[PDB]
Amino acid sequence: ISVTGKNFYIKTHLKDKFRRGLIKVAQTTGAWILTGGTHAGVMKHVGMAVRDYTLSSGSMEGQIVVIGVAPWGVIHNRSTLIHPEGRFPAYYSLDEQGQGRLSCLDINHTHFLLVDDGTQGHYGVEIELRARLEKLISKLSVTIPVVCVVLDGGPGTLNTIYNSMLNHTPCVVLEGSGRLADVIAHVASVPVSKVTMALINRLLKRFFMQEYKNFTELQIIEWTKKIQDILRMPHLLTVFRIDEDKNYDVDVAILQALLKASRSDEHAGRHCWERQLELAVAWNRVDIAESEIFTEESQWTSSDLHPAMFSALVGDKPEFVRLLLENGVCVREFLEREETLCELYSHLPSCFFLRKLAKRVQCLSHVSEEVRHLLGSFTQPLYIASRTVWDPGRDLFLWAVVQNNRELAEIGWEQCRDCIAAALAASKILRKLAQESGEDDSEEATEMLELANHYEKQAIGVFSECHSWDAQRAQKLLIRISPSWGRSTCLWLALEAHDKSFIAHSGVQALLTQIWCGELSVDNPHWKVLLCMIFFPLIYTGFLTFRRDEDIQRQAERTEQQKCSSRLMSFLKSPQVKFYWNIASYFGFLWLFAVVLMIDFQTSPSWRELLLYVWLTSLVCEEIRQLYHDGFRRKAKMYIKDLWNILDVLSIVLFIAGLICRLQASDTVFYIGKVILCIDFIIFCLRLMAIFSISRTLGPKIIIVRRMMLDLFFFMFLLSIWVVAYGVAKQGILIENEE
Amino acid sequence: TIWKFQRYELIKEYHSRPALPPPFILLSHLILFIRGRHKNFRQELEQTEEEELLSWEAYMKDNYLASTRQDESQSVEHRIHDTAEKVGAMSELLEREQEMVXXXXXXXXXXXXXXXXXXXXXXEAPHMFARQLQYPDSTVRRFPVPEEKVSWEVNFSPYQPPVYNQQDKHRNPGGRTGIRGKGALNTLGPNHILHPIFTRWRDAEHKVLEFLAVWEDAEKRWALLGGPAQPDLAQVLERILGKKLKTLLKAGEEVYKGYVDDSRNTDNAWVETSIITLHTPLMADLNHMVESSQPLQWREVSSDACRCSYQREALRQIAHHH
Amino acid sequence: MSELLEREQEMVXXXXXXXXXXXXXXXXXXXXXXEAPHMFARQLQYP
Numbered sequence A: 001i002s003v004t005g006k007n008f009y010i011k012t013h014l015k016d017k018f019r020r021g022l023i024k025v026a027q028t029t030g031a032w033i034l035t036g037g038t039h040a041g042v043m044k045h046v047g048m049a050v051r052d053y054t055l056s057s058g059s060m061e062g063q064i065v066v067i068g069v070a071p072w073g074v075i076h077n078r079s080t081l082i083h084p085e086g087r088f089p090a091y092y093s094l095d096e097q098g099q100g101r102l103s104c105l106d107i108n109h110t111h112f113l114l115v116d117d118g119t120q121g122h123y124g125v126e127i128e129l130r131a132r133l134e135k136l137i138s139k140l141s142v143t144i145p146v147v148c149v150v151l152d153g154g155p156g157t158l159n160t161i162y163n164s165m166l167n168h169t170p171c172v173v174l175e176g177s178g179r180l181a182d183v184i185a186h187v188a189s190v191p192v193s194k195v196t197m198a199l200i201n202r203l204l205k206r207f208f209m210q211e212y213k214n215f216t217e218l219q220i221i222e223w224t225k226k227i228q229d230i231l232r233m234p235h236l237l238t239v240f241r242i243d244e245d246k247n248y249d250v251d252v253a254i255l256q257a258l259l260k261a262s263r264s265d266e267h268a269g270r271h272c273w274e275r276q277l278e279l280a281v282a283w284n285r286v287d288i289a290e291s292e293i294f295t296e297e298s299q300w301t302s303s304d305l306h307p308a309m310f311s312a313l314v315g316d317k318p319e320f321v322r323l324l325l326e327n328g329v330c331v332r333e334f335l336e337r338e339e340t341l342c343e344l345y346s347h348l349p350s351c352f353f354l355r356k357l358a359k360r361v362q363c364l365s366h367v368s369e370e371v372r373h374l375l376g377s378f379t380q381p382l383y384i385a386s387r388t389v390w391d392p393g394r395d396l397f398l399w400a401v402v403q404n405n406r407e408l409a410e411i412g413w414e415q416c417r418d419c420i421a422a423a424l425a426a427s428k429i430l431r432k433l434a435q436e437s438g439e440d441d442s443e444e445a446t447e448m449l450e451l452a453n454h455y456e457k458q459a460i461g462v463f464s465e466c467h468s469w470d471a472q473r474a475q476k477l478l479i480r481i482s483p484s485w486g487r488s489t490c491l492w493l494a495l496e497a498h499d500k501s502f503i504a505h506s507g508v509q510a511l512l513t514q515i516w517c518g519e520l521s522v523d524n525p526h527w528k529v530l531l532c533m534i535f536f537p538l539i540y541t542g543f544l545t546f547r548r549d550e551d552i553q554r555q556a557e558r559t560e561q562q563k564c565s566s567r568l569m570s571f572l573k574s575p576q577v578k579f580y581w582n583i584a585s586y587f588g589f590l591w592l593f594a595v596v597l598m599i600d601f602q603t604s605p606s607w608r609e610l611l612l613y614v615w616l617t618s619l620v621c622e623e624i625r626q627l628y629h630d631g632f633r634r635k636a637k638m639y640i641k642d643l644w645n646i647l648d649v650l651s652i653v654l655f656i657a658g659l660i661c662r663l664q665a666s667d668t669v670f671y672i673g674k675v676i677l678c679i680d681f682i683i684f685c686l687r688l689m690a691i692f693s694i695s696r697t698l699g700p701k702i703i704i705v706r707r708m709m710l711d712l713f714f715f716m717f718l719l720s721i722w723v724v725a726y727g728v729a730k731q732g733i734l735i736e737n738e739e
Numbered sequence B: 001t002i003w004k005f006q007r008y009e010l011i012k013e014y015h016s017r018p019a020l021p022p023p024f025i026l027l028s029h030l031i032l033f034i035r036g037r038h039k040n041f042r043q044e045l046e047q048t049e050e051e052e053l054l055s056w057e058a059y060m061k062d063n064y065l066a067s068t069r070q071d072e073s074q075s076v077e078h079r080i081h082d083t084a085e086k087v088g089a090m091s092e093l094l095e096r097e098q099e100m101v102x103x104x105x106x107x108x109x110x111x112x113x114x115x116x117x118x119x120x121x122x123x124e125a126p127h128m129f130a131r132q133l134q135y136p137d138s139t140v141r142r143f144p145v146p147e148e149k150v151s152w153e154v155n156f157s158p159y160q161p162p163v164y165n166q167q168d169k170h171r172n173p174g175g176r177t178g179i180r181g182k183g184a185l186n187t188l189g190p191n192h193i194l195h196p197i198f199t200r201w202r203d204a205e206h207k208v209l210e211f212l213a214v215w216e217d218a219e220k221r222w223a224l225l226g227g228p229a230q231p232d233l234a235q236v237l238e239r240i241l242g243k244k245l246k247t248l249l250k251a252g253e254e255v256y257k258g259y260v261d262d263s264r265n266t267d268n269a270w271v272e273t274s275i276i277t278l279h280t281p282l283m284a285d286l287n288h289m290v291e292s293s294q295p296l297q298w299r300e301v302s303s304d305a306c307r308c309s310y311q312r313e314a315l316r317q318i319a320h321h322h
Numbered sequence C: 001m002s003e004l005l006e007r008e009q010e011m012v013x014x015x016x017x018x019x020x021x022x023x024x025x026x027x028x029x030x031x032x033x034x035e036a037p038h039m040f041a042r043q044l045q046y047p
Ligand SMILES: Nc1ncnc2c1ncn2[C@@H]1O[C@H](COP(=O)(O)OP(=O)(O)OC[C@H]2O[C@H](O)[C@H](O)[C@@H]2O)[C@@H](O)[C@H]1O
Pocket: A004, A005, A006, A007, A035, A036, A037, A038, A039, A040, A070, A071, A074, A101, A103, A123, A127, A152, A153, A154, A155, A156, A157, A158, A160, A179
């Protein structure tokens, strides 16, 4: 971009909009900016603008090059710079007070060409070189896009416009700028009629207010011929309306000049539209690309877009990636090489995740450890080292919902297959990083929780519509194993994720009840179940409908409209009868253990004491079967992570300690054994109490234990200081000095 | 909430364990241990049915998503933005159309009223390449010649073109050229170029035309070869075809002849030309000679020849005549 | 606004065009060449 705008009076609104826009087009691409080097006016203006940006980034990236071209004989203190020795850092004296001819450099630039023709008194000779330079770095390679911007101006602006546009490097003219720019903005019609010396003289009297007496007839006719030669090429020029709040800044002007150049070009349709789009993504102008290059006539292929859309996905451009996937980018072809996925996780921006991930780094196969730690570890691991089903949509949505780009994450989900699984897995990993976020970040954390709530609502919406569509297919859908997303199932994953508003849905409660009744019916009440638990052959006599009989009657009816030992064992394999029968056995256990704690407690163990010994061997055998069906020490670590089984382990180790102290002969350890057995009794009764109220979770139990031990400790501490100080004051009153 | 979770965990534990409580689980675990998955919670589906199942799930998702988009379009927090954008477009279009909104018609009517009373009482672009400021291969800038100053029919006063011939009467028709003298032209007069008809019937020769054309100029696309020959006859053009590139049966037609534009046109010297174009696709006497310049081919298209108005008119004549 | 727009569009040249055509013609031809009655008397019941 070259800016070729000594005396210009722009008002502050346009100057501020132009400063901000030219910085926002400086920081984007890594692009060169070319200017005449004199510190008078707009060259110093863009020098101050690029100085303010290069302080604002702290020289961390880019260092935008401002190469300048200036005439040798017009500069001020060149004899301080005229040594035949090289590489020496010379000092320049700006001083703001040069002579009327010799202006000075702007020191906010960085590179300087000084062109030397020996004229020593005129500004004009230098330019004939400068536009030639533009063509050279247009000839360097596809070609580099080239564009000049034009503001207020004079005679120098008109000559550099003319010597640019005769070399096919197009130019943009800013409206509302004053001297020459508003002249070319007024000439927007009548290519034959407007070019008269009279109309140009009328306009140059209308705009060039103060300098109008400096005109001569040779200069006005050279001007009129130059502007007639300029305006006769209407496909390289563009007048450009002012930077307004109605979605127009200099990025739109630069794009439209690039396209009105490349439209009527000879051979731009084969290769220029690539770098056209690759620039168009960097400024996030969705409507211009949507209305200009994604037209009906282009008829591209889908694999060629795969660079460009990648950048639109590497920097959180949601509306633009929707435009890409609507125009023909297909996610299945996108993720073919796994190196693209490695690049995606390489270019992952800053979040809580990669901060937690680089600790494990100090590799896509490396990601699965942080995944399965953030998820429940009971799943399989995924993302294997070499293609564990590939499934691109799951990978894309996983990346998205990890990096927390929300409006990108909806696009990640709507393309995915296996909907309810991925929705709830996103909910689980969100709530896991919500809890595990230790560095405060309270707005970040509440956005995390809001996102997890959103996806839980999405999952119950999809499943509610599936359940209103069919019934038994939805029951087939809940218990499904998933090829994708490892080895989990939906109901388990929602149960472990504690998604409180999903498991209290009507259909999933119906499936839970239909498991919990088992082979019996789901319609009979529970008191008839207790009465069937009373009498053993009354199951032959009771009403007590079954799954088999119910379905048979039901199955037969639909068709018409359209056109001893096994049975009692099947009763016996219910979970409800197993539960009631087990808790009655547990009550009998409490009764006999409370009997022989007190009465039949001789030195040698008694008859019923041996019965209590064999029921506790029975309980430890049932516990070891529980461990045997649901590495090996990893299975033990997953076993102890419950709340009921830690109580049963503590109970059996305390019982075996009390029993092995009941073998002894001393009376003190005999009493100690009685003490251990009694406290073990109340541990068992507390386990029966917690068989109803408490759950299997340990997390919020640990947190509640900490926060209530805190309050009890604190109130006991202030109670202790009040107790101790009152007691010692009473001792200081009601006794003498001696004690 | 917690009642459902307690019910779930209760359903989760006791589904696994067998019957016969610890008084007889000492029996039952022993006979299971000496004996030797579950298809209710976690079941493995066969791949025959998972495809239909996932497709039905995706169709249900599509239905839900369409329903949510439609009922998101109904809330008033969206209708307010819709009416805002529509009123913005309406006010912009109303200002634009009122800016497009009879005096001339009234004047015409007045003229009709009058003229009638009187009756009752009774009874283009110039040669712009010649105006290009830098004359080629020369240190001479021409004078600025505007578009109203083109022809000699009107007079602009301070018009002093510096005469400049190359040291190796007339007026320029159709445009003031800003420089006098022969320049890079040989004579101080209308040097005539001639052009031999180079064409052939292209592939799919029904309404087509190819031509053996030369790209030795290191310039834009292919033009047919030729040369400025001796003016005034056609056997000199035959000798020019023999020289720059016998044959008896031929003719010459579609002769564009006259003033041709250049960046070398001066006040008194200019270029004029005579370009012809006419022609089985063989042309055996034309395929007899092998043409040497390496850049030269058979241009089978007629896409305006990618050159000046002479070559564009030459391509238009072969596109119209055949 | 909608009521006034319907009313004003209902107030919205053929006659003018016809007049113009007549002017075009008539000119060519020229070139070629060179109240209430007495209502009380109508009252139905004669007094
Ligand atoms: N390179 C220069 N450095 C300092 N002052 C200059 C320069 N050129 C002209 N002036 C002063 O401009 C004043 C006239 O004001 P106006 O006509 O509105 O600006 P212009 O059209 O002349 O700018 C032409 C330059 O701008 C572009 O960068 C081109 O490359 C040119 O180098 C005179 O007093 C000059 O001293």
